[PDB]
Amino acid sequence: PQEYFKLRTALINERRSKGINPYPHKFHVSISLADFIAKYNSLEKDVILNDIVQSVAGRVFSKRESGGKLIFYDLHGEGTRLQVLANARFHSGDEAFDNLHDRIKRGDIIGVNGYPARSKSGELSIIPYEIIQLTPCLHMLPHTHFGNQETRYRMRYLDLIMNPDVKNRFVTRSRMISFLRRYLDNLGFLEVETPMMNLIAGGATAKPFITHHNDLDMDLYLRVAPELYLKMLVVGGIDRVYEIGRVFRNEGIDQTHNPEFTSCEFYMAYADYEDLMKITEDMLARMVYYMHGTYKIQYHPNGIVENPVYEVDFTPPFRKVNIYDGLQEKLGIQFPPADTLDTDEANKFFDKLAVEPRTTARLLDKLIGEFLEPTFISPTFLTGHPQIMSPLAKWHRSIPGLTERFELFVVTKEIVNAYTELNDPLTQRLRFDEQAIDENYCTALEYGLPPTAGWGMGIDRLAMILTDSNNIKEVLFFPAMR
Amino acid sequence: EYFKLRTALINERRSKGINPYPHKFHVSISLADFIAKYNSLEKDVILNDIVQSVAGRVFSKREKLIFYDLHGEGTRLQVLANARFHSGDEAFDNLHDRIKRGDIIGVNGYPARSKSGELSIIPYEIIQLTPCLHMLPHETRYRMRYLDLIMNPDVKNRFVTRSRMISFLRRYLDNLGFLEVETPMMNLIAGGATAKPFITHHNDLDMDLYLRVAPELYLKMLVVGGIDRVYEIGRVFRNEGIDQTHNPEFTSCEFYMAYADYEDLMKITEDMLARMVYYMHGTYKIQYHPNGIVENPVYEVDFTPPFRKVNIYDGLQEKLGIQFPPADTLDTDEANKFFDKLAVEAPRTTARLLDKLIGEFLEPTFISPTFLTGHPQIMSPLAKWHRSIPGLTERFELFVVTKEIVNAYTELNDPLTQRLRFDENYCTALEYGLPPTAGWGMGIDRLAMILTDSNNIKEVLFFPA
Ligand SMILES: C[C@H]1CCC[C@H](C[C@H]2Cc3cc(O)cc(O)c3C(=O)O2)O1
Ligand SMILES: C[C@H]1CCC[C@H](C[C@H]2Cc3cc(O)cc(O)c3C(=O)O2)O1
Ligand SMILES: N[C@@H](CCCC[NH3+])C(=O)O
Ligand SMILES: N[C@@H](CCCC[NH3+])C(=O)O
C-alpha cells in the first residue's frame, strides 16, 4: 500500500529527471462534461464524429482494460460522468499506446482531446486522439468496497472523491443559505457586518475566546453574537438589519455542537415576537417545500440505519407551549411567577427530580432540558422564559416574571432564539456573572430603540435537520474533530 | 445635563403607572411606500376616508400647528399636528411637550397634501414609542456610529452600496456555476498570505489555535475533492495593526477555478470589475479623491478594459535604471538588492527589500487598475512557477489608486513545494492531486473604499478600531 506510493513517486521522479514535467500548467477545456452530455445526446449506437474535436477534462474514477486496442476510463467531472474510450486506432501521438496507458492510473486527473462518439452498446463517450496527464495521483484510492469513521472528517477531500453524497449534501446547504438570503433581501433587509472582536464580546450566554491584539496592548474577545451591534444599527435608522456570519463559542465539541458555527441573526423594527412566529413558520415551511418537495420529511437520530425515525412536520402552524404551564403539568407542582428569591432558590433545588453552580436560571435551564425539550420532535415554540435567563428580552405585557422570548425546537434541539428587544435603559444585569454587559450599549439605548423584534438561528443545525445527519461534523467541511 | 431632566420626566411618568416604552405599534405602511403611494394625490386635498399608521424618528420639531420631520428608512415625511384633528383627552397641549426631537414616535393619521404641494400626514393620535434621553447635536463618530447614522442619514448609502456590491459579486460567481462554501476560521497552523496571526486558546481541546489568516489552503483542498469552482466571502483576521487601508478584521472574497490559468483570471477580473463599476455608477470611468477633507488631487480611475499589464523586473529595472540578476535564491543577490542609496528603506531579505522597492518606486504610478505580474518564487510560495521565464511565478496583483485590491495566481500543482523560509495535512492532500487551477482573492473593504470614494477604511466599516 505504501510501497505503491513509493513506486509511483519513483516513476514521477524519474519522469521529472528525464526533463518531463509530471504536473502540466494549462489544459484547454473545450466543453463542459454536463454541456457535453446534454449535447451529442442525438448520437446513435456505434457512431463517431471524427470531424469534430472536443476537449474535456476530469478525474479518472475507474480503469477498465479490454486487453489490447481498447481501454475504458470512467471520467468524473463535477456531478457527471463520461466514458473516455481509448482506442489504439485513434491514438495520434509519439507516445507508444502501450507505455502511455501505464502512465494513467485510477485517481489521476486527465485532460482529453477527442471525438464525440456513442459506442455500439450505447455508452456516450469521447474517443481521444491524445491524452494529457494533468495530475498524477501518487496514492492508492479505495476499491469502492471502502472509502469510514474518523478518517472521513480529517481528510475531507478523499471523502468527497469516494462518496459524492457528501457533495450533494453540501450543495444543498449552500443553496439553503442562498434561499434564506434571497428571502430576507426580498423582505427589504440589508445584509451588514459587525466586528468579530470586542472588548466584552456581547452578547450571549456562553464562554468566549480570548486573543491578544498586538497594536493596542490589549486582549480582545471573539464575538459570541452580533446582537448588540445590530441593535445599535437599528437605533441609527436602519429598520431591518440582517447578518449571516460565524460565531465563536468556547463550549466543548459535540455531535450537535462546534466551537465555531454559522449563525444568522436579523432584527426587524415595529414588530413583536408574535410577528416573528408567523415569519418563522412561513420561512421554514416554504424552505422545506422548496428543498424536498413536501412539508413532511424524515429524520433519523441513529443515522439512517434502522434507528427510530422522527417524522418532522413543518406544516404551519407549529404548536405553542409555555414554560410554566408545561413544566407545572409535567412535574405536578405550583411555581411562583417572580422568583429572584433565595427562598425561591431552595424550591427549584428541592424539586431536583434527580436531573443533575446551582442558581435559579441554571436549574431552570436544566429542568427544561430534561423534561420539556426531549418531547420536541415536530417543531415547537417554547414561550415565556424568565428574566433571569433572558436579560435582553422585553418584559411580558401580562406575566410579571416572564419575558417575550421564545425558542424553536426541532428534533429535541434549539435552532432559533428570538425576542422582543428591550428598549428600556433600566436593564438589570446578572449578579453572579459565572460562565455567562456592555457600557456603550445602554448608552446606545438612551438615544432610543424602536419597538423591535430580534431573531437568530443556527445555520449549521438547520443544515443538520434538513440533511438528516446526527452529527454536526457532517455539514461542516473541516470540523473541529481533533 | 439635559439627560438628567428628561430621565427625570420619564421616570416620574414611570411612577404614575404609565409605560414609557410600549410594546407593539402597528405600522400600516413604510414611509417610502407612503410617499410613493400618495405622490399622485391632488393638491389642497385632505383624505378623511383613509387612515394610515406610519412611525419614525423625529428629526425636528417646529411649533395651532406643530411640524414634525419624520425620518424613516431613507425618506422623510412631514407630520402635521393640528389641534382640530386631535382625538384625545390631552387636547394637543400637554401631549406635544412630551415628544421632543430624537424621540421615536408612531402616528395614526390622514394623508393630506397642502396647497403648497408638501405631502403630509395629519395625526389624530400620536403614540411615543421610545424617548430620546440625550440631546441631539445642531472623530468620535467612529466610536458611536448610531449617532452618526441618526444625524447624517446619508451615511447609510455607503453601506447599502457595499451590500449591493457583495450581492452583485454573489450573483456574478453564481452565474458561473460557483458554489459558495465556508471554511474554518480557526487553525492550528494558519496558512495563507504573509501576515502575523492571532493566537487564541480552545479549552475543550486544551490547545492553542490560530485564527484564519486566509481561506487559501482549505479552498484548495475543496478543489482537490472534485468541487470544480469554489468561492468564499467572509471575514479574515490579521494582526498587523490599524491604518487608513488596514483594519485587523476585514472581509475577503476568494474563488478557485480548475482548468484555468492566471491569464483567464485577468480576462475575468477585467470583465467583472467593468460590469460592476458600470452597474454602480453610470460609466466605466469614475472619480476618486484620496484626500477626504480636501479635494486635491483627483485620480481618474478608468475601468475600461484592458488594464495595463506590467512586469516586476521590466518596470523596476527601468524605473531604477539598473539591470537585476536573474531569479536567484542565493545570498549574493541580496547584496545587490539592498539599494541603500535609493533610500527606499525590520529584517531585510531579498523578498522584503524587493517588496519595499516595488512599494516606493513602482506602485505609486498605478491609478487606473493595473496588473503587476511575475513575482519571484521567493515571495510567492503557493504560485506555480512561470512556464517561460524561470525562477518566476504566474502570480499577479492588481493595483488601483496605489493600493492592492486583488491577488491571483496559478496554484502550485507540484507536491514538491519548497516552503522553506528563514529568519502536514495540506501537502499530503496535493499528492492525491490538484487539477491545473487558478486562485483569486480580493479585499472587499478596499473595493468599497474605491467605490464609496472614501480615503479611510473606517468609513466603509460600521465599527472600526
Ligand atoms: C445562533 C444561535 C441562536 C440560538 C440557537 C442556536 C444555538 C447554538 C448554540 C451552539 C453552541 C456551541 O458551542 C456549538 C453549536 O454548534 C451551537 C449551535 O449550533 O446552536 O444558534
Ligand atoms: C485577500 C487580499 C487580496 C489582495 C487585496 C487585499 C489585501 C488585504 C491586505 C490587508 C492586510 C491587513 O493587515 C489589513 C487589511 O485591511 C488588509 C486589506 O484590507 O487588504 O485582500
Ligand atoms: N445570543 C443568542 C442568539 C441571538 C438571540 C437574539 N434574539 C443565543 O445564542 O442564545
Ligand atoms: N494569500 C492571498 C489571498 C489568496 C489569494 C489566492 N489567489 C493574499 O495575498 O492575501
Numbering used by the authors:
A (entry chain B): 5 to 151, 154 to 362, 370 to 449, 462 to 507
B (entry chain A): 7 to 69, 73 to 147, 156 to 362, 369 to 446, 464 to 505
Q: Which statements did the authors publish about this structure?
A:
Lysyl-tRNA synthetase (KRS) couples L-lysine to cognate tRNAs, and is the only aaRS that has evolved in different organisms to fall in both class I and II. LlKRS folds into a canonical eukaryotic KRS and contains N-terminal OB fold anticodon binding domain and a C-terminal catalytic domain. The fungal metabolite cladosporin is a potent and selective inhibitor of the malaria parasite protein translation machinery enzyme lysyl-tRNA synthetase (KRS). We discovered that cladosporin is a very potent inhibitor of L. loa and S. mansoni KRSs, and has enzyme inhibitory IC50 values in low nanomolar ranges (~52 nM and ~97 nM respectively).
To understand the atomic basis of KRS-cladosporin binding, we solved the crystal structure L. loa KRS in complex with cladosporin (CLD) and L-lysine (K). Crystal packing analysis showed two dimers of LlKRS in the crystallographic asymmetric unit, validating our GPC results on recombinant LlKRS. Cladosporin fits into the ATP binding site in LlKRS and interacts with most of the residues that accommodate adenosine moiety of ATP. The isocoumarin ring of cladosporin is stabilized mainly by π-π staking with Phe344, T-stacking with His-340 and hydrogen bondings with Asn341 backbone and Glu334. In addition, guanidine group from Arg563 and Arg332 also stabilize the isocoumarin moiety. Gly560 provides hydrophobic support to tetrahydropyran ring (THP) whereas the Ser346 lends suitable space for its methyl moeity. The L-lysine binds in the inner region of active site pocket and is accommodated by series of hydrogen bondings with protein atoms. The active site region and binding mechanism of cladosporin for both LlKRS and HsKRS is remarkably similar, with only difference of Ser346/Thr337 (Ll/Hs) and distant Val329/Gln321 (Ll/Hs) substitutions. It is clear that the residues Ser346 and Val329 provide extra space for accommodating the methyl moiety of THP ring, and they thus contribute to species selectivity. The drug showed concentration-dependent enzymatic inhibition and revealed IC50 values of 52 nM and 97 nM for wild type LlKRS and SmKRS respectively, while a significantly higher IC50 value of 1370 nM was observed for the human-like LlKRS mutant protein.
